[PDB]
Design a binder for this molecule. Sequence first.
Ligand SMILES: COc1ccc(C(=O)CCC(=O)O)c(O)c1
Ligand SMILES: COc1ccc(C(=O)CCC(=O)O)c(O)c1
Lengths: 318, 318
Amino acid sequence: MGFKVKLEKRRNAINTCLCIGLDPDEKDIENFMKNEKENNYNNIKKNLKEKYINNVSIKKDILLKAPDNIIREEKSEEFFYFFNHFCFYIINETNKYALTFKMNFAFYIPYGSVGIDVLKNVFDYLYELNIPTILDMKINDIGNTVKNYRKFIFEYLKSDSCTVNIYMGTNMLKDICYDEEKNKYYSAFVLVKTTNPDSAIFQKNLSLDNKQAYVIMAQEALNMSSYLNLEQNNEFIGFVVGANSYDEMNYIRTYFPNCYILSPGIGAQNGDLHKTLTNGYHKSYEKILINIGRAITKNPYPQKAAQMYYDQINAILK
Amino acid sequence: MGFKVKLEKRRNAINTCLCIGLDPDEKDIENFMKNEKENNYNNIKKNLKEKYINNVSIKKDILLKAPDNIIREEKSEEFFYFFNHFCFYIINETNKYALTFKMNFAFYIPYGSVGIDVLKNVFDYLYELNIPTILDMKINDIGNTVKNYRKFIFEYLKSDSCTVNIYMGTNMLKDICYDEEKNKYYSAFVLVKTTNPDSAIFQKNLSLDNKQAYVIMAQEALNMSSYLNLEQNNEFIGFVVGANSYDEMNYIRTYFPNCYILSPGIGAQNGDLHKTLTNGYHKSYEKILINIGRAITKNPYPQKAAQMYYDQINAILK
Ligand SMILES: COc1ccc(C(=O)CCC(=O)O)c(O)c1
Ligand SMILES: COc1ccc(C(=O)CCC(=O)O)c(O)c1
């Protein structure tokens, strides 16, 4: 059922709000392939034995084959196989620490269709482990058009949420968060403050009445969720606020109690995790997701790294 | 070469600024297939005679497969077949009238990888035709992440340009419009004024120094075009300005002569073409692109709809 119900009952099960990012780059794949080839396909063998690997839908005939795919012909299909197995490897090594997983679309698109097949299988894999999902795609377009992203994200990947950029207009969120022909509803996180070093330039130097753009936008987003029947239908519109923007985090949390927040920036940006950004927030702590990607995924022991953050988080939660 | 120079050359060769939108939805593909499954594969037989379809890189064998279906092997590939053949038919029927084709990424993703194969084949076919290309994808993210879009768009599809949403910042363009490790420069059109009903909330009501958002945004974009050194390299950052934004079109062509503007909104939105759009913001006219999508591709006779619009735009260019 609904995502609000999926976040609470999950954080009940595992007691954190760590969100693990899975953004594999060319180097992550090329390197997992090297290690696997020089270690008799170790983690792939692990992968290939996990229970719910059968629940993926794209190219099972190649994915679930044992690795005599080196040059037992099947040359062309190598990249597919290791890209996907790498993703499986990180999910398997870390899912016991993660409330949600956030996959950023841009990492899956630059080789063409092969990465979309990987992104599809990764989303099936998470679905079946019934683990909350986010696609970080910052979608934005006109309505007839944006419904294509909705078909992509919630029907095909079957994702539980997505990031959206609302600069074109708050109205786009109507053909993102609701399908009428289906009568289904869906959740989203709108960009409020992002972690890029020049983000102030528009989300701050721009204002409507001595209010900064991010507040207006935040205010706009949350009035659109109220306008749709999402809270009621167990879905939400929430906010992306970067981990390095502390003042703004304390602003949003007080002047918007009960909102869902998704917070990127800890690790490869770091700054202070235990500033007014994780703390200041509490009950139903699924409402403040701390995204960590590369500090886990580029760590030689992703399991270790995941626990490290799961415990730091599970300490500051007091 | 470089995009400006490609733009100039075609503009002399064909005397227009018509940009044709290639956004095929599901009704388009099914309808294309039924008419052909009726009219004896008339238009597909014509695609099969075209020089460049022998150059396409994904599923040549399928795509070139005997005009009919002869109800053989593939049912797996029927949707791919008729999607790609619909796009080739539009291009074939309309290309002599187009200064540029714009493809909207959204229409090519919601079926998973199959439509990314189509889109790839469509950019390959356009590349071989040497016809100016825009991917309308409205990309945005942080720098490390956004290089993946630049890869997809400029290396993988070999597009000439794309649409970008700069709301997060201007810094992202260093990683879109510029590739240092290849020392390549690429062109883009940033969102300035968009055609969705509520497009003013942020675009017009936000401000700094009594200037509206879309004026700072357009200014700052151009400040990065100068920082990146893109003109010197025959490339640019330009502006998306909705056809129905009469006043603002006038304003930007006034305060930023020589800028490159992309204008969508004619046909499947109202109102018309002269009405200020093309004359508000006239120049040396590859700099004012008039995008027309559905009113060409959803018309029974696309070549004729193309011609008719091409006639209108030329007439208006005095
Ligand atoms: C889930 O994907 C991510 C995304 C970002 C980070 C950072 O910490 C870097 C953020 C910045 O440098 O602005 C990460 O570790 C994983
Ligand atoms: C790119 O080709 C297109 C695609 C879609 C439309 C619309 O349906 C309305 C556009 C709007 O409301 O701004 C169009 O006029 C042209």
